[PDB]
């Protein structure tokens, strides 16, 4: 990365959406990496995500208001590289550099999905999916998230 | 009335005790050399009248200034024992108050409180000269509001 900006013009802003009381969508912070639309269409098996517009705008969302009903919808938080998609329950409760991550498994499902439990000062903040490939890869159910 | 007399004798005694302290200074860290800066002419901590060294037995208030490590832990407590009554200690600086910048270190007791009881907590790292001189003035007023003779007559 550089150390200073050459941008002297106005910026661009996008209307925020709401696709479920479990993920927060700040679409202005999106980088149009289209990681969301692919994860939904190929892995989640749903098509509630898409990229509308022509030009710089290129809004990514649902056009018509909808909600992410996927049982694996929680992983799209992990997929988004920016703060465009974030966990609603965790929203502004902790910051990453203070969480003492620990490893455990899912129990809601018999799969025993490997999870990373992020705790801080003696309480559990977030359930993050671990990497195990052949059993759970890097994704966990919405219930255990 | 005897209550009025015990009040006047109370006022007469502590007026000296709030104007004639003698500080046994414990020179430990940057808070300690900062004290001697207060005794410098710019602030004159001797005009109220408390001598900069005051010796062990010729002392009233022990200003605990600096980091208090367990190395010095028994030496200060034995010193506090030798300090005659009425004796008060003013914990100076974040290190002596609660530990400050070395609170989590392995070789420092977290706060001078855990070793001796403190009358005045002056904060700073280091506290500015008057910021501790004000604390001395705070201890000065703390001596004004005591009921020593009054409690004895009440008993």
């Amino acid at each position: 990365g550089s150390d200073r900006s050459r941008f002297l013009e106005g910026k661009r802003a996008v209307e925020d959406k709401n696709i479920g009381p479990l993920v927060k969508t700040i679409m202005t912070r999106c980088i149009q990496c289209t990681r969301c639309i692919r994860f939904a269409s190929e892995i989640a098996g749903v098509d509630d995500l898409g990229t509308t517009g022509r030009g710089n705008d290129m809004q990514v969302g649902t056009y018509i208001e909808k909600m992410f009903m996927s049982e694996l919808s929680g992983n799209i938080i992990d997929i988004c590289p920016v703060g465009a998609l974030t966990s609603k329950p965790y929203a502004f409760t902790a910051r990453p550099w203070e969480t003492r991550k620990t490893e455990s498994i899912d129990v809601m499902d018999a799969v025993g999905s490997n999870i990373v439990v992020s705790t801080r000062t003696g309480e559990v903040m977030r359930i993050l999916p671990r990497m195990h490939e052949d059993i759970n890869e890097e994704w966990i159910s919405d219930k255990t998230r | 009335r005897g209550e009025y007399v015990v009040a006047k004798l109370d006022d007469l005694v502590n007026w000296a005790r709030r104007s004639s302290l003698w500080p046994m200074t414990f020179g430990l860290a940057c808070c300690a050399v900062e004290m001697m800066h207060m005794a410098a002419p710019r602030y004159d901590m001797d005009r109220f009248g408390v001598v900069f060294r005051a010796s062990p037995r010729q002392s009233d208030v022990m200003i605990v200034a600096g980091t208090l490590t367990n190395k010095m832990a028994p030496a200060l407590r034995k010193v506090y024992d030798q300090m005659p009554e009425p004796r008060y200690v003013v914990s100076m600086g974040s290190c002596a108050n609660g530990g400050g910048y070395y609170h989590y270190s392995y070789s420092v007791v977290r706060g001078c409180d855990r070793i001796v009881p403190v009358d005045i907590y002056v904060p700073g790292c280091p506290p500015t000269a008057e910021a501790l001189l004000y604390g001395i003035l705070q201890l000065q007023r703390k001596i004004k509001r005591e009921k020593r003779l009054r409690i004895w007559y009440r008993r």
């Binding site: 990365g1 150390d3 200073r4 900006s5 941008f7 550099w97 | 940057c30």
Partner: protein, 238 residues
């Protein structure tokens, strides 16, 4: 105030004038110190030949600062290995013969005057420029830049969460500290934290020779020895 990459804050306007005011009057005060102290027989007698270390014993003992200069060793980090900007300045190193504490007392006093000329040249030749490096990855951006340009916000955010990552290495850099040679041996893991940073406390080597410079003299002179040994408990006890 001094940070990796420069000084964090700027010089407030009118600050250097007061430096000029104090420096002009400072020399007058130091003569008052000498007038009371230099020729005083009681002080001199209590500080001549009381505590003395030879050239090879001092230099072998890891001594530095005043003691090598007091013993006559022609060494000073500012002149031999001029760091920062000390190359472009004029001064002298007050060394002396004999090696006792009176000359060490004289060494410090002439350092005062030889210091005073440095500030005199420094505020006479203060150049205009930015206070910190123009590298945002090591220097936090200006507050106005933070609230206007994003890369300033991101870099300041990362500079104030983990900070810059120092590449691995192991350097012992020492400078002419006012009391001696202060050095830090810092090994870098390659992350945003130092793996291990060992402090070369000048008094730590100085107090190590307390046996040598307090051999034979009367008991009353030991406090004088630490007085000229110049031991501050802050760094010798680490």
């Amino acid at each position: 105030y001094i940070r990796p990459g420069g000084v964090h804050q700027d010089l407030p306007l009118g600050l250097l004038d007061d430096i000029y005011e104090f420096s002009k009057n400072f020399s007058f005060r130091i003569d008052e110190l000498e007038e009371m102290l230099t020729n005083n027989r009681i002080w001199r007698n209590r500080t001549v030949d009381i505590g003395v270390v030879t050239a090879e014993d001092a230099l072998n003992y890891g001594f530095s600062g005043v003691m090598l200069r007091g013993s006559g060793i022609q060494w000073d980090l500012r002149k031999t290995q001029p760091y920062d900007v000390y190359d472009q300045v004029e001064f002298d190193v007050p060394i002396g013969s004999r090696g006792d504490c009176y000359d060490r007392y004289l060494c410090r006093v002439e350092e005062m005057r030889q210091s005073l000329r440095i500030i005199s040249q420094c505020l006479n030749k203060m150049p205009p420029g930015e206070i910190k490096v123009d590298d945002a990855k090591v220097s936090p951006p200006k507050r106005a830049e933070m609230k206007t340009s994003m890369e300033s916000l991101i870099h300041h955010f990362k500079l104030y969460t983990e900070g810059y990552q120092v590449p691995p290495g192991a350097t012992y850099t020492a400078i002419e500290a006012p009391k001696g040679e202060f050095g830090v041996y810092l090994v870098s893991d390659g992350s945003s934290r130092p793996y291990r940073c060992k402090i070369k406390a000048p008094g730590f080597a100085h107090l190590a020779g307390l046996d040598k410079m307090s051999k034979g003299h009367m008991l009353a002179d030991v406090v004088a020895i630490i007085g000229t040994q110049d031991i501050v408990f802050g760094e010798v006890d680490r």
